Amino acid sequence: ALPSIQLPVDYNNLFNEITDFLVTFKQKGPKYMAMLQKVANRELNSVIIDLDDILQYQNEKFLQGTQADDLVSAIQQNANHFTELFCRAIDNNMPLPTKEIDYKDDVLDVILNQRRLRNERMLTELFPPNLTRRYFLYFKPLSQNCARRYRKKAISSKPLSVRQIKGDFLGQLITVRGIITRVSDVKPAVEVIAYTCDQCGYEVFQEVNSRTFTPLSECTSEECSQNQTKGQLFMSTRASKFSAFQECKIQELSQQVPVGHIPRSLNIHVNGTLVRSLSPGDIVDVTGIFLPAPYTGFKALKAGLLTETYLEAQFVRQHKKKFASFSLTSDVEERVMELITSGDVYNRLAKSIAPEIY
Amino acid sequence: DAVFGDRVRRFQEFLDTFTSYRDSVRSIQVYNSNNAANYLNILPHRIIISLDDLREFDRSFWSGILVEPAYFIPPAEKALTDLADSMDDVPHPNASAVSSRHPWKLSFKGSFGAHALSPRTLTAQHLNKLVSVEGIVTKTSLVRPKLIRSVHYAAKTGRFHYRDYTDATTTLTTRIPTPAIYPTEDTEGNKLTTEYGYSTFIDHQRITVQEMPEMAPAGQLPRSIDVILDDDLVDKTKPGDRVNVVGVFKSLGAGGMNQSNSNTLIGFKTLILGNTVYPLHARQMLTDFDIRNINKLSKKKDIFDILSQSLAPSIYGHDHIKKAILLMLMGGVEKNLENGSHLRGDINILMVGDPSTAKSQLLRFVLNTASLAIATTGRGSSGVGLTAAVTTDRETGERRLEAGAMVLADRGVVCIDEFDKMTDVDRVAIHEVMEQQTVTIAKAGIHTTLNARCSVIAAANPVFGQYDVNRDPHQNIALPDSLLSRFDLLFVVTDDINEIRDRSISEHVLRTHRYLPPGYLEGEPVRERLNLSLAVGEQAGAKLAKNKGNYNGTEIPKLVTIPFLRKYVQYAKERVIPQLTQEAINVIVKNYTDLRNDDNTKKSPITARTLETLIRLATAHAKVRLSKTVNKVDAKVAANLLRFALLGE
DNA sequence: AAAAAAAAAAAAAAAAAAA
DNA sequence: TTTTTTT
Ligand SMILES: Nc1ncnc2c1ncn2[C@@H]1O[C@H](COP(=O)(O)OP(=O)(O)OP(=O)(O)O)[C@@H](O)[C@H]1O
Ligand SMILES: [Mg+2]
Ligand SMILES: [Zn+2]
């Protein structure tokens, strides 16, 4: 069937190290418990992780000869698997809320309570974790001075051009640079789809990660495991889960285009709270995951091995400059005081516009 | 079966016989190791063999390669991979990188003989045979990655599984195809998650190469063939380049032999799996004694006029034109300021004159002499089709910009004939590229700025049949002053009727028409010839074979041959970036103030932009004599040349 | 089962304009 | 009034 190979990696030790880092980290007490507490209070809606903390923690714990491997290397080599590991670790170590909650507003939790008091009262199903998470998980690339701190070449970063990306970088975490040209609108994207089968006790849930799927028609409840269905099932919009989605493409800068060449483009998919964090016509430094994209969406049956590629955003530096709408501050106030003390202004302003033209 | 093993061990013996390739392999390995973790370039796993040595070792294996590469190349690649693996010694490797298994594919060089063809000559009997074809690059497709071998993981088992995918164009040998369906279920129902970052993806690009139109039959159009190259060398060169590619010529696809045929007269596809690519360039490096000769020429007092007179010896007179061409081919430097944006750096020259005074011939000479140049005609071009085009790539179904004419000649020179005979609309585009040397395309959902820093040389006819010397210079020209002021230098040529000059030019022309190619008799016409013997090619300072350049004795002043002049230009455009000084400033400002207030008749009005022309001409002349500073002599020569070009001797 | 179409190039007839 | 050029 499928041959097997031996790899040096094993995820059990990685997961244990992840949990140990999350619980024991000292940078207020531990930082990550401080975030997770306000997450529990339904105050924080997205979690951002820094690997500089991971690197420095691993290096400083290397002073005691117990650690055997490192994490940032495997993080750089592959990313999504570590996103799943991090979400599992967070859900295992989720703190209790220290504050009151406006609990009536959570309509999804009302539906969940109804379903539980319907099924468990008669003697219950384990709901998938993704249907319950209120938080988004984001990664942040490291800083070069942190790499300079140690001998190892834990670099990443290095804002490659659009054409500097090859087919060997698929799956890694890479940083690009360029001008944003097009930004699409915001549309809802499905994550978990919930149906209802005309009072079939538990209502079936399913999840889809691909950009296309197929629906359900007959439920597996025992009364419908009977030869004929206890009421036809329909898709329920309220119970299902959605995430904000947007699509943008980036174009190479003129300076980085080799002579006698045409600039190329690269697509970017953005999800979660980071949506609407960039506008067309600006220079940015985007860090993301370089993932493949199947061509079957075109449905041409050709390109048996050819596939398209895209990037998924993780952390955006807007860069460029802020107009700020002359928003008042102490520094600009002392600047205008200096201008008032300057006395006559208009002649100096005229002299200072275009000194190149005499 | 065992024939593969015998061929592999024979190739191992051959590799062990020679020691150069092993030295190259160990150099590559040590460079790769040194680039690992020492405070961006990498070397691909490719080595070039010279099959002349292989022929001198074994004729059977050489013949097998050159007749049926399918059964011979893979064993050689396997043996090379085994040797590289044995020589490799990495006790502490990485995890994802070690599973690459790069097979170290080969490249060839040497004499082919009857297997060096042209795109017109390729036909049925040449299929399945290694070949080397020359041509010009017409168009290129888009770089797209493709999958080879995926990696899966299952949480329960902890055992990684991998599946390998290959297509007809991936490998030389036909095998049962495998679809791109991801296996996500084990044999016992375990869930398998595809592991990105551990799978294998390689680049892919398709180009099409065309035969050179100069070597074409009587009244027949140039033709083209299809080339696929991948892995390394994936985006070398560009459209509009002379290349020579060596690869396997094979047929693929059912072609309608199945039930899908709709007519009896169907055919098959033909395609080339490229192995290696070389820049033909009709070579570009400098030797030690070459630099010594360039230096000893430069330190001479009178190099500039010798170089000027060296241009196009068959054209009589027009010495100042030759000097202007020489200065234009190696113009001044670009200036960019954090606040002052950009300043134009090269020179532009326009020619207007009476008919049949050898302008097109000199333009053709400039075409042949310069490194990169493109030929355009006013009546045979369209302005929108000159800069960019919106065309849809066939494989992707997406419309992408196609490079225009003058964009291909970025940093080069573009020559235009019958300039005044061009449609006025196109002219405005020229103004744009003469304003900031940048063309912008905003159409059909594409907004992009394209760089174009080329220089323009052109010739145009007066409004009448002949130039009228008694009229307003603006009256004699059909072009608006808006773009005429852009050109730095404008020349007016007229054939004054003097019997002495008539006799001299008659003697020169009659001397020219009595020329015979060396080694050839006069009784028969010029015939076509074969290519060079080797498809790929490559004591000092004591011979001066072509260094002095004086091929024959006709005048006391020396002359230099074209290749030496091109080598001098190549050295000068890279090795020196001169800077001006205050003495040249004083001379230039004095001349500008004098010329501004001479207050007499002149061919064209002067303005502030002429000082820029003086600055750039002085910089170019400093580049000519290979000095890092501009001295007042260059200011003097620039002023004299400007006075000649605008006042008249 | 279906890629199908915006972007170019070239050939006219009508109207208006300049001599 | 006629031929030219643009739509
Ligand atoms: N000084 C000269 N030396 C050699 N040949 C000359 C010289 N002057 C004119 N000729 C000849 O005159 C002929 C004119 O050819 P060509 O069409 O290139 O000239 P031109 O001035 O560029 O004309 P046009 O404006 O019609 O293109 C050529 O055959 C060229 O050899
Ligand atoms: Mg001519
Ligand atoms: Zn039901």
Short mmCIF file of N, CA and C in Angstrom, two decimals, chain B residues 28 55 63 123 128 234 264 294 307 317 345 368 426 459 487 549-550 562 577:
data_model
loop_
_atom_site.label_atom_id
_atom_site.label_comp_id
_atom_site.label_asym_id
_atom_site.label_seq_id
_atom_site.Cartn_x
_atom_site.Cartn_y
_atom_site.Cartn_z
N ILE B 28 31.59 21.49 -4.51
CA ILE B 28 30.18 21.80 -4.28
C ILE B 28 29.78 21.41 -2.87
N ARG B 55 33.65 9.57 -25.38
CA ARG B 55 33.90 8.90 -26.65
C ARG B 55 35.31 8.32 -26.70
N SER B 63 27.78 6.06 -28.06
CA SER B 63 26.78 5.85 -29.11
C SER B 63 25.41 5.58 -28.51
N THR B 123 12.51 16.61 -37.48
CA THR B 123 11.49 15.83 -38.15
C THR B 123 11.41 14.45 -37.50
N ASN B 128 13.40 10.76 -30.23
CA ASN B 128 14.02 9.89 -29.23
C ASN B 128 15.54 9.97 -29.24
N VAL B 234 15.54 27.34 -14.09
CA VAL B 234 14.12 27.38 -14.39
C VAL B 234 13.67 28.73 -14.93
N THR B 264 -9.85 11.83 -39.32
CA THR B 264 -8.83 10.88 -39.72
C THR B 264 -7.44 11.51 -39.75
N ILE B 294 44.13 46.83 -22.68
CA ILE B 294 43.19 47.94 -22.52
C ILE B 294 43.86 49.09 -21.78
N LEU B 307 39.46 55.36 -31.70
CA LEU B 307 38.24 54.59 -31.49
C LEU B 307 37.09 55.13 -32.33
N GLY B 317 33.67 60.30 -44.37
CA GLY B 317 33.28 61.50 -43.67
C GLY B 317 32.52 61.18 -42.39
N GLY B 345 20.37 59.74 -17.48
CA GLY B 345 21.79 59.47 -17.47
C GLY B 345 22.49 59.29 -18.80
N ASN B 368 24.58 46.38 -35.16
CA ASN B 368 25.48 45.24 -35.07
C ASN B 368 26.54 45.43 -33.99
N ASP B 426 1.28 57.30 -31.65
CA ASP B 426 2.40 56.60 -31.05
C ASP B 426 3.42 57.57 -30.48
N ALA B 459 16.51 58.47 -37.21
CA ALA B 459 16.76 59.29 -38.39
C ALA B 459 15.44 59.61 -39.07
N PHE B 487 15.66 65.64 -27.19
CA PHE B 487 16.89 65.09 -27.75
C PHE B 487 18.07 66.00 -27.45
N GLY B 549 45.05 45.57 -33.57
CA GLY B 549 43.88 45.78 -34.39
C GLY B 549 44.16 46.14 -35.83
N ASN B 550 45.39 46.51 -36.17
CA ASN B 550 45.71 46.90 -37.54
C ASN B 550 45.77 45.67 -38.43
N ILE B 562 36.60 45.14 -34.27
CA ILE B 562 35.34 45.28 -33.53
C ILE B 562 35.37 44.55 -32.19
N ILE B 577 33.42 54.67 -12.53
CA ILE B 577 32.30 55.58 -12.31
C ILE B 577 32.89 56.95 -11.96
#
